[PDB]
Amino acid sequence: FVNQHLCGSHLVEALYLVCXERXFFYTKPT
């Protein structure tokens, strides 16, 4: 992977996949 700009639930849909068990947390409202 060298190019896959993702935003909204899409950008996390990738995070939700990378983990899929730990329950990552998008720090957007940080």
Next chain:
Amino acid sequence: GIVEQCCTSICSLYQLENYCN
């Protein structure tokens, strides 16, 4: 945070992999 890196730059599942908890 990463919004400007995953929404503007490239979001590699490897870099965001450190966003687990």
